[PDB]
Chains A and B, each alone.
With several copies, the nearest count.
Chain A
């Protein structure tokens, strides 16, 4: 799954 940081960005 994609990283939370990139997703929140």
Chain B
């Protein structure tokens, strides 16, 4: 969990946005301006990232629920696979508004969702109508899109790992209102004050995003190793 200060360099972590869209709070992590862009200071970046990795690793050891948030369509697919690979569930695209707080109200929603899935191999064959059938399938699709990937939790998650943060400012606000710790790949235009582990990367190119996903994925497997057995053969 000490990704070479050079691997990210080729990934694209150094290229932020332009000044026209630059969070002034991010000054501590600036190196200059290539073609009026803002090159994140990787040397400043890297200790924080590795530190959060360790933090997140001890979490998974205590068996604290982790979570990830979907972003752009490419990001969402990548997040899903990495999450499904181990555990820790995952959001997809919308964050379903006030999921946190209204977690009890969306719990009833999850209940109805699972029933429909179960009754999707039951109610479909019997009493099928050219009208009701389309109803069932379509609603399930919509529900699945976002609610799917969270239905497993069956309770309040104990951590969150979002990306960019700005695109999901709503998610961070609710998490701050409960104590649930979070991690965010803040970029040159993202308010990091609400984050407890500022990862000053770049939510872009996917390439670099895939690096962050791969990294954390590895740390949570170390947590599972403490939950299963040590390395040997």
Do A and B touch, yes or no (CB under 8 Å, in the complex)? yes
Report the interface size for chain B: residues with CB under 8 A from the other chain: 6
Closest to B34 in A: A2
With an 8 A cutoff between CB atoms, is B130 at the interface? no
Closest to A1 in B: B10
Report the interface size for chain A: residues with CB under 8 A from the other chain: 4
With an 8 A cutoff between CB atoms, is A7 at the interface? yes
Give how many A-B residue pairs fall within 8 Å (CB-CB): 7
A7 to B43, CA, bound (A): 10
Complex interface bits, B36-63 against A, C-beta within 8 A gives 1, otherwise 0 = 0000001100000000000000000000
- Which residues does chain B contribute within 8 Å of A4, judged by CB atoms? 6
- Which residues does chain A contribute within 8 Å of B9, judged by CB atoms? 1, 7
A5 to B10, CA, bound (A): 15
Nearest CB on B from A3, distance (A)? 11
A9 to B22, CA, bound (A): 23
Closest to A4 in B: B6
A9 to B228, CA, bound (A): 45
7 contacts across the A-B interface (CB closer than 8 A): A1-B9, A1-B10, A4-B6, A7-B9, A7-B14, A7-B42, A8-B43
User: Which residues of A are in contact with B by a Cβ distance under 8 Å?
Assistant: 1, 4, 7-8
